[PDB]
């Protein structure tokens, strides 16, 4: 059918924006991520989302942030948007301190863990590495 | 009615499982800047999977890596749109 927008709020947009990482990780800075975060914020704010940006979050901070969002009341929200900007590997997302499984973040909003959002779209946008393969491309017409 | 607890998620990934994901110096990641430009252009017109298809196209066609790092030059990227949505998703009540 289509997801109903007949709610007071289209919903929340949570942006997790990680530029600088724990030197013990050896991960290089992600310069220009503030460009990404600001562009996302502007875009989603123009469609009526209430945008909150959380900068340079550790794994445990991320978890508390999203657990809080999960446990909130979204009965007036039509949808939830979450944008994840960080380093990554196959199946994991780097906090500033170390990696966490992506499934652990996104399962916080699963239908039985977040009843305020059952039947409404949970939209994740994930800018992170997922491994170390490189795509050489292929020429076409 | 009962629905699956995993339903109504969308995971729009910047890149294919197992692959690197690319950024420009300081003009944003390829994926996020294409996402923002298609959201800007079509967010009031297309539904979400139509938009992300045009994001996949823009990332796949308009970007190619330039690097002096050995083995990282002239590389390509395609994003990875994982849908467990059960309905069309539009961001406006009436698409124009």
């Amino acid at each position: 059918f289509r997801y109903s927008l007949n709610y007071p709020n289209i919903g929340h947009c949570i942006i997790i924006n990680n530029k600088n990482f724990d030197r013990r990780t050896g991960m290089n800075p992600r310069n220009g991520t503030d460009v990404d975060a600001g562009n996302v914020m502007n875009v989603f704010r123009k469609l009526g989302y209430i945008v909150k940006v959380y900068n340079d979050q550790t794994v445990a901070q991320i978890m508390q942030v999203l657990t809080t969002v999960a446990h909130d009341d979204h009965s007036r929200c039509a949808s939830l948007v979450c944008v994840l900007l960080s380093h990554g590997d196959e199946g994991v997302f780097f906090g500033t301190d170390t990696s966490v499984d992506l499934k652990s973040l996104t399962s916080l909003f699963r239908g039985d863990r977040c009843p305020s959002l059952v039947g409404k779209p949970k939209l994740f946008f994930i800018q992170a590495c997922r491994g170390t393969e490189l795509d050489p491309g292929v020429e076409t017409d | 009615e009962r629905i699956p607890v995993e339903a109504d998620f969308l995971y729009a990934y910047s890149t294919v499982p197992g692959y690197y994901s690319w950024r420009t110096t300081m003009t944003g990641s390829w994926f996020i800047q294409s996402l923002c430009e298609m959201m800007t252009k079509y967010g009031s017109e297309l539904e979400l999977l139509q938009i992300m298809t045009r994001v996949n196209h823009k990332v796949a066609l308009d970007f190619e890596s330039t690097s002096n790092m050995p083995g990282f030059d002239a590389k390509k990227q395609i994003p990875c749109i994982v849908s467990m949505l059960t309905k069309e998703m539009y961001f406006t009540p009436l698409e124009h």
Binding site: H87, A128 | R23
Partner: peptide, 4 residues
């Protein structure tokens, strides 16, 4: 261009 650089990587994440």
């Amino acid at each position: 261009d650089e990587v994440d």
